[PDB]
Design a protein around this nucleic acid. Structure first.
Ligand SMILES: [Mg+2]
Ligand SMILES: [Mg+2]
Ligand SMILES: [Mg+2]
Ligand SMILES: [Mg+2]
Ligand SMILES: [Mg+2]
Ligand SMILES: [Mg+2]
Ligand SMILES: [Mg+2]
Ligand SMILES: [Mg+2]
Ligand SMILES: [Mg+2]
Ligand SMILES: [Mg+2]
Ligand SMILES: [Mg+2]
Ligand SMILES: [Mg+2]
Ligand SMILES: [Mg+2]
Ligand SMILES: [Mg+2]
Ligand SMILES: [Mg+2]
Ligand SMILES: [Mg+2]
Ligand SMILES: [Mg+2]
Ligand SMILES: [Mg+2]
Ligand SMILES: [Mg+2]
Ligand SMILES: [Mg+2]
Ligand SMILES: [Mg+2]
Ligand SMILES: [Mg+2]
Ligand SMILES: [Mg+2]
Ligand SMILES: [Mg+2]
Ligand SMILES: [Mg+2]
Ligand SMILES: [Mg+2]
Ligand SMILES: [Mg+2]
Ligand SMILES: [Mg+2]
Ligand SMILES: [Mg+2]
Ligand SMILES: [Mg+2]
Ligand SMILES: [Mg+2]
Ligand SMILES: [Mg+2]
Ligand SMILES: [Mg+2]
Ligand SMILES: [Mg+2]
Ligand SMILES: [Mg+2]
Ligand SMILES: [Mg+2]
Lengths: 185, 148, 156, 51, 53, 222
RNA sequence: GAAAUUGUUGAAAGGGAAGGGCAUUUGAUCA
RNA sequence: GGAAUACUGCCAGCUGGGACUGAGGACUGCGACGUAAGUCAAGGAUGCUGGCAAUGGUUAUAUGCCGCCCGUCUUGAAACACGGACCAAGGAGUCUAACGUCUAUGCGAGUGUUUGGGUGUAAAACCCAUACGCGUAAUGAAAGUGAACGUAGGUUGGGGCCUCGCAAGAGGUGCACAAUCGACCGAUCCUGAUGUCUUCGGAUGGAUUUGAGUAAGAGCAUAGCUGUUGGGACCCGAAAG
RNA sequence: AAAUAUGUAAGAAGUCCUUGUUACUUAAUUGAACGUGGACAUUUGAAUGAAGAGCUUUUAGUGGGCCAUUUUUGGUAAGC
């Protein structure tokens, strides 16, 4: 026998396939298993592993936030990349001259770009434009503001949005929620 | 799909997932939300504070219509303009000859100020409005009239 | 259909084998296998008979005969490990050796061509073996084994 | 696919350690170290067989 | 410890190139002849039992 | 457009010269060993010549083999034999014996057998059972290219340079010993020489320190 | 027209149950 | 005094006897040899000769050794604990509603055809107007009020991208996330300007006080496992009312 | 007044220097806290080891235990 040091026969802990049986994306994975393995371009690793993620580790970037990532000091006229979907945003009009690749686009996505002269490219048409990811900005969606996560690990004095269906007064609001009824949380 | 369950894997495992000591008896805790104040006090003071007692005064025969006042913030407000009409109102921006937007027609009752505006003069009639909205509407040249 | 055959397949290519890095030798033979030693048959039809050691035929068999008119032993191939090494010297030579290579015993009612070679070899030797007294009379006496003998103590 | 061990299979004893073959010429394990004629002191041996 | 560590790195290149700034644990002691001169070994042996109380 | 044999006839000379630079230090090591040890014996006989004792320089390296089974072990002795790569029976490794290294061997003493190994013991031990940790991958050490590749950072490229780098506990002993794998030894050939093996060596048992004796033991566990 | 259970036939075993695991002799039987 | 021998130990000293195994299957490796052809024990066995049309597997019995009857409750069962004489068929975690998590799909600040209409080859499919639900704002018991000082903030770290450097490195930009300090909306406690139907209005600046808030939105719908509660609710079971 | 057991520490989130911010403090530009800007990769600051570490969600069974060495309490004792 052996005085085993750490847990034997433990699996990785990390996704290696987005098991959407989506035959089309199940092709893009096989393409990038090429790149990171035969480029060593550190950009080529990131997006392939970031390709696998489930829908919630894949939040949307909005045309809103991409606009300012080139209001970044020294990016205004460069192409960007983000794995996933991208949404229109009717709250910005100073949209720039630009070009961007992402999994799929909403309606206004391809609108706000054309209205400002931009372009909306599928990423398969990207991989040949920057093999090593030359001059590629990557932005991620804000994973930790989905509605569900706002009650993860709620306890007393952590004040984190109890799980409740009908909301308002009389609904989990008196005892344990003010010193007027016993105590507060 | 029945086969996709896991209770078809418990077949041949006498206690069928529910154990030899603890067995799957019918109602160990009391039926439903029984004993919330006695032997479930942790799981309701925790996860569900404010749950007991009365918290404030009541109102007899209320109607969720008297307080229908949907809020729109200065964020959108130009979606009440077709795009084949707003860029031809962004360029071509003037006090006279100005685009107007009836809030209430879109189904809104109060207008609040969140997200500052393009400066094209817009004059839009609402019923109730937040103060910061009126000011940043007057900063673009426009004003607010009051409908009912 | 009734089974639906697979698609990934092998294919009938007897893969080339790879070098056997092996080098041979004639037996690094036992220390007492000196040509011209009486030896003792242990397996075969004549098994048990006593013989005299001659050429180490290049297929590792060991030519020996009785001579023939001694113990009816023709000149024969033997595997070394089926004959024990006695300790009994013979003469230098007088025997033709070079004729018996490993081919010699290729078989294709009696035979005519090597019977006179055996009758050259035998008299070439018996003229020597009676030089020593009762050794002629000793190999004449086919070997046998007797009761109570402990081989770990018995020399030859 | 397999490990061969030195101290047997003497060919691989030279894949490492080439000095090995110089080792074989000079006995090196039977190196006759050359003698010294120093005699132990007396105040030491007296106490070594002191009761 | 670090104040003593301050100067001892100046002499890294100032004198040569030799630094030695790390701390280290105790070591088995090195070879040391020790002499009989005025120090002859005092042979000893155990003692028997007795009460004396 | 051949480009082929240009880059491969450079390694014949590369290897013949790195072999010639291995040779030099190997011969230098035999020189080192016999000069040091004959100087030791001569200092002993010189102090005995002029009436005194040359005290042995207390040892700087010790070999340790763990024995007792996987099970029924207190938390902290279990922890420390986990802490010295010793998670199996008859496995073993070396220790740089400082006197901080030292006080853990005296916590595991009834589960191990250890002491001071001869050159020849260590050489026979790392020739037959020397293994290297490579992305853990427990590689066997068929030739010196691999310690060249892992420890070209220490001027250490020969197997006997490595032997020297531990039998002399060299300035980068630890970066070498940790690279070495634990040594999967068998049970000793001539038995354990003691009937019940879980008593201290001093007590006719088999655990504890056996200073020059583990040699006889470990050479038997070949 | 199954099992339990039952009869004839045939083969083998059996000193206070039987059945079983391992390897083998022996006999039977499948390249 | 001059030696030999014992004990202990080193040999990269020499040779015999036995046993087990022979994975891999173009070549690719570091070797060894020589002066050079060319060789080899050097990244896993070859070669010669001899034998059967045999030897292999299963089964029954015999021998050697080992083996208490399952299931169950149990700290503890072969138990003098319970059920089980034997056999066939039936024989127990289901469906539903409303839900937690996570996953797959479509669309995306929106989503959701199927109350209903249109249509139809007819319970399918197909197409559709208004509404509606949920989300898109919160917060107070409430009347109520209702999210940019700024490149929507600083700071620490941060993947990736950028610039120089051969490179090592150096700097730049820094999303997700983590931490923290501020800024913004509601609550509460304050501070209380011009104006005055003299009590109205609540400017401005604030705080060891509170919210499940904004701070360049993420959700909505469908389905799947799992989990929850209500249900006959895994299946059989009372004394009772 | 031990043994065993135990709390903090062994650097770059550091150490030096400069004088900026403020409604705190001081008689005081005094100190307080937080920064600008400025300097030192061998041996970046003990030993050893690491199939690498951090972080989140959701949920099963369980909540009758017993034994052994050493410490130990009640009981004469107990397979208490
Ligand atoms: Mg095992
Ligand atoms: Mg309190
Ligand atoms: Mg189970
Ligand atoms: Mg059962
Ligand atoms: Mg279960
Ligand atoms: Mg049960
Ligand atoms: Mg239960
Ligand atoms: Mg034996
Ligand atoms: Mg014993
Ligand atoms: Mg029947
Ligand atoms: Mg009978
Ligand atoms: Mg009877
Ligand atoms: Mg039997
Ligand atoms: Mg000896
Ligand atoms: Mg030897
Ligand atoms: Mg028995
Ligand atoms: Mg009981
Ligand atoms: Mg039982
Ligand atoms: Mg039992
Ligand atoms: Mg009983
Ligand atoms: Mg019962
Ligand atoms: Mg019964
Ligand atoms: Mg019966
Ligand atoms: Mg059935
Ligand atoms: Mg219609
Ligand atoms: Mg219609
Ligand atoms: Mg119509
Ligand atoms: Mg009933
Ligand atoms: Mg009744
Ligand atoms: Mg009643
Ligand atoms: Mg690692
Ligand atoms: Mg749990
Ligand atoms: Mg539970
Ligand atoms: Mg639990
Ligand atoms: Mg219980
Ligand atoms: Mg025990």
């Amino acid at each position: 026998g052996i005085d085993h040091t750490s847990k034997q026969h433990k699996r990785s802990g990390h996704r290696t396939a987005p098991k959407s049986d989506n035959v089309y994306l199940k092709l893009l994975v096989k393409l990038y298993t090429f790149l990171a393995r035969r480029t060593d371009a550190p950009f080529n690793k990131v997006v392939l592993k970031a390709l696998f993620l489930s829908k919630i580790n894949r939040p949307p970037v909005s045309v809103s936030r991409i606009a300012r990532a080139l209001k970044q000091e020294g990016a205004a006229n460069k192409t960007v990349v983000v794995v996933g979907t991208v949404t229109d945003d009717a709250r910005i009009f100073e949209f720039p001259k630009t070009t961007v690749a992402a999994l799929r686009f909403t309606a206004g996505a391809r609108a706000k770009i054309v209205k400002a002269g931009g372009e909306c490219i599928t990423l398969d048409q990207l991989a040949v434009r920057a093999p090593k990811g030359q001059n590629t900005l990557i932005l991620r969606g804000p994973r930790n503001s989905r509605e569900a996560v706002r009650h993860f690990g709620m306890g007393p004095h952590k004040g984190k949005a109890p799980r409740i269906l009908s909301t308002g007064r009389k609904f989990e609001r008196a005892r344990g929620r003010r010193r007027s009824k016993g105590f507060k949380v | 799909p029945s086969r996709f369950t896991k209770t078809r894997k418990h077949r041949g495992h006498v206690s069928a997932g529910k154990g030899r000591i603890g067995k799957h008896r019918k109602h160990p805790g009391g039926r439903g939300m029984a004993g919330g104040q006695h032997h479930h006090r942790i799981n309701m003071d925790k996860y569900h504070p404010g749950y007991f007692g009365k918290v404030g005064m009541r109102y007899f025969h209320k109607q969720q219509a008297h307080f229908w006042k949907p809020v729109l913030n200065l964020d959108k407000l130009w979606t009440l303009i077709p795009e084949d009409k707003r860029d031809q109102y962004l360029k071509s921006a003037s006090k006279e000859t100005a685009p107007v937007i009836d809030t209430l027609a879109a189904g809104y009752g109060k207008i609040l100020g969140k997200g500052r505006i393009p400066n094209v003069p817009v004059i839009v009639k609402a019923r109730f409005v937040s103060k910061l909205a009126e000011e940043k509407i007057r900063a673009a040249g426009g004003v607010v009239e009051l409908i009912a | 259909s009734a089974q639906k055959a697979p698609k990934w397949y092998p294919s009938e290519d007897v893969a080339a084998l790879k070098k056997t890095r092996k080098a041979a030798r004639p037996q690094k033979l036992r220390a007492s296998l000196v040509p011209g030693t009486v030896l003792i048959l242990l397996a075969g039809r004549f098994r048990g008979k006593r013989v005299v050691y001659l050429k180490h035929l290049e297929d590792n068999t060991l030519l020996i005969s009785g001579p023939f008119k001694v113990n009816g032993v023709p000149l024969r191939r033997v595997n070394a490990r089926y004959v024990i090494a006695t300790s009994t010297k013979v003469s230098v030579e007088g025997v033709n050796v070079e004729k018996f290579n490993v081919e010699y015993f290729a078989k294709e009612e009696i035979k005519a061509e090597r019977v006179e070679d055996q009758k050259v070899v035998d008299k070439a030797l018996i003229a020597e073996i009676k030089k020593t007294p009762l050794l002629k009379q000793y190999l004449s006496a086919s070997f046998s084994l007797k009761n109570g003998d402990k081989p770990h103590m018995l020399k030859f | 696919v397999l490990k061969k061990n030195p101290l047997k299979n003497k060919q691989v004893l030279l894949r490492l350690n080439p000095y090995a073959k110089v080792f074989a010429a000079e006995k090196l394990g039977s190196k006759k170290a050359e003698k010294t004629g120093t005699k132990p002191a007396a105040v030491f041996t007296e106490t070594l067989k002191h009761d | 410890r670090v104040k003593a560590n301050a100067a001892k790195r100046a002499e890294a290149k100032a004198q040569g190139v030799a630094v030695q700034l790390k701390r280290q644990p105790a070591q088995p002691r090195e070879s040391r002849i020790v002499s009989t001169e005025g120090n002859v070994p005092q042979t000893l042996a155990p003692v028997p039992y007795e009460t004396f109380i | 457009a051949e480009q082929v044999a240009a880059e491969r006839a450079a390694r014949k000379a590369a290897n013949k010269e790195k072999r010639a630079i291995i040779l030099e230090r190997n011969a230098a090591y035999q020189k080192e060993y016999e000069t040091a040890e004959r100087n030791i014996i001569q200092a002993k006989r010189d102090a005995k010549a002029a009436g005194s004792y040359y005290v042995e320089a207390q040892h700087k390296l010790v070999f340790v083999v763990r024995i007792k089974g996987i099970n029924k072990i207190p938390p902290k002795p279990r922890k420390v034999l986990q802490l010295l790569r010793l998670t199996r029976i008859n496995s073993g490794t070396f220790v740089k014996v400082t006197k901080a290294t030292l006080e853990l061997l005296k916590l595991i003493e009834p589960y191990v057998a250890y002491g001071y190994p001869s050159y020849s013991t260590i050489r026979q031990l790392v020739y037959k059972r020397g293994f290297g940790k490579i992305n853990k991958q427990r590689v066997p050490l068929s030739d010196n290219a691999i310690i060249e590749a892992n420890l070209g950072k220490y001027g250490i490229l020969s197997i006997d340079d490595l032997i020297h780098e531990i039998i002399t506990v060299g300035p980068h002993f630890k970066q070498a010993n940790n690279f070495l794998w634990p040594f999967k030894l068998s049970n000793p050939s001539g038995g354990w020489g003691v009937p019940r093996k879980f008593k201290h060596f001093i007590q006719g048992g088999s655990f504890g320190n056996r200073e020059e004796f583990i040699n006889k033991l470990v050479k038997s566990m070949n």
